[PDB]
Symmetry: D2
Subunit: 104 residues, 4 copies
């Protein structure tokens, strides 16, 4: 069994982790990596951003081929139902628990 | 000024919102949309997923051209420093505040 | 059939609320009220604070100044197991869902 | 120069911790301890609970049964403005950062 801090260090190394308290169900959390993207690609290609954000980027960067915007790493959950919940957050219980385990 | 609930309804409609308490700084939050992705593309194309997740998908879906996995909508923050924080979360203060405003 | 924003407005008015899927486990959330306490009370009376915090207050707030410290309102959950989780937080799913209901 | 996991272990041992960038504003987080309270006390004594919750306990827990209710440990923040934010939550950035420090 691990603390949440050990779970986090495992997540940073690319592993899948879970809490025993979740009682299996095929649930686990994982980390999606950071990347820095060109603003022109943000404006002209990226599907998964709302138009208001893309318009803001376009207004402040124009046609720049060199400007970039950093998208941070973040945690996600593969839920029991199979869906990926982007932006998983840790409850007080999760943060203080010592029942974390490695899934992969 | 708006409650967090009004801010959320604005976010669902694609707007950028902020709290006055943040004191400007060009900060705002926004919603990234939901999508359902083919598992073959998850395995063979998606860059922004860790290899452990991609290997799990490959082992359970193989070469399927029809299986899909849903990635939920989520909130993000465009921070003062210009970075996009994926998976923004609301503090108790944020949830209970009535100083939310529309940015765009 | 209530958004999270409407659930929050109901919580601010003292109700117990839940998402429909929680019914089987009987979970709900509620809001604990704000209060402002005098520094002497914090240092010498309040049991539910760690010694380091009481000590910080004593040394960074003379109780000779007449100062009070505000303890903010916050959300809590009555869990399936019957425990009270202080400091409940909303997942992306919870924030964007429209299946909230009033329990009382 | 501490991960969030090491910060959590220090919090569990009663310390006040912060991220380095918080120094200018003097913010820190701390853990409030768990306790178990008898139901009669919850219904008839505890001020810092809403009436609906006290009423729920009274009607879903006879105080004739000898039952106690556990109130979990949780994190809090001493904010820049000096207020105590009950139920502090960790952002993705906070969870993945390695700039945590012990304040006391
Ligand atoms: N709604 C939704 N769609 C998803 C999600 N994950 C993947 N997709 C879809 O899969 C496409 C390819 O993802 P990719 O290979 O990571 O290719 C991505 C990736 O390389 C990069 N990118 C965009 N946003 C981020 C981000 O927040 N973090 C990282 N690390 N890369 C990102 O930009 C490329 C193009 O992005 P898109 O045009 O959006 O193209 C995305 C998008 O249509 C998700 O969680 N939600
Ligand atoms: N560990 C733990 N114990 C709990 C909890 N809820 C109640 N108690 C216990 O019940 C006692 C009485 O609570 P109270 O009548 O609300 O009486 C409280 C309340 O009036 C006030 N107070 C302290 N902290 C807060 C806070 O964060 N918010 C509010 N609104 N009042 C607070 O100070 C009084 C004395 O506090 P204590 O000496 O701590 O005394 C508390 C504490 O021993 C909980 O969630 N966790």
């Amino acid at each position: 069994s691990m603390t949440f801090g050990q779970a986090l260090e495992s997540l940073k190394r690319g592993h899948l982790v879970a809490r025993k308290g979740w009682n299996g169900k095929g649930m686990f959390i994982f980390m999606r990596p950071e990347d820095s993207l060109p603003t022109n690609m943000i404006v002209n290609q990226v599907k998964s951003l709302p138009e208001s954000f893309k318009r803001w980027v376009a207004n402040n960067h124009g046609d720049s081929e060199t400007d970039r915007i950093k998208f941070t790493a973040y945690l996600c959950m593969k839920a029991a139902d199979g869906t990926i919940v982007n932006g998983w957050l840790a409850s007080q219980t999760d943060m203080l628990a010592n029942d974390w385990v490695i899934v992969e």
